[PDB]
Design a protein that fits this description.
- The PDB classes it as immune system.
- Keywords: Hexamer, immune system.
- The entry is titled "HerA Hexamer".
- Chains A, B are HerA.
- The structure is cut from a larger assembly and holds two copies of chain A.
- Chain A is mostly helical.
- Helix content of chain A is 55%, strand content 0%.
- Chain A has helices at 2-5, 13-31, 49-59.
- In chain A, helix 2 (13-31) packs across helix 3.
- The first copy, chain A, is globular and about 35 Å long.
Chain lengths: 62, 62
Amino acid sequence: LEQIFIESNEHNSHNQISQFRHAVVRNKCKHNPTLTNLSFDTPVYFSIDEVVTYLENMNNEV
Amino acid sequence: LEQIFIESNEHNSHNQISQFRHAVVRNKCKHNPTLTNLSFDTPVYFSIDEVVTYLENMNNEV
């Protein structure tokens, strides 16, 4: 995932990856509610455009 | 600072590090009001016990 969607030139790459994973996990959860113990590395369906929207909102926040 | 206060065998690093930085920068800006454009690496006074207080408080939130 990271090697696809990201390049680590971001000095603050930490602060980016954190939110990336947070949003991924929440999307997994709400898209598959019957289960638990979800994690970044879990193979279940989840959306992408929603993650992007989430990040936009985070970036244009007041 | 990292090599001193931290070990790298924890993947929560992507969050621990960011919060540690934020706290350090805030204390720096606090004890040195006059100046600006500060950052993590600026060589100026800053207490640390207060940083530990901050981390405890944050780890015990609800």
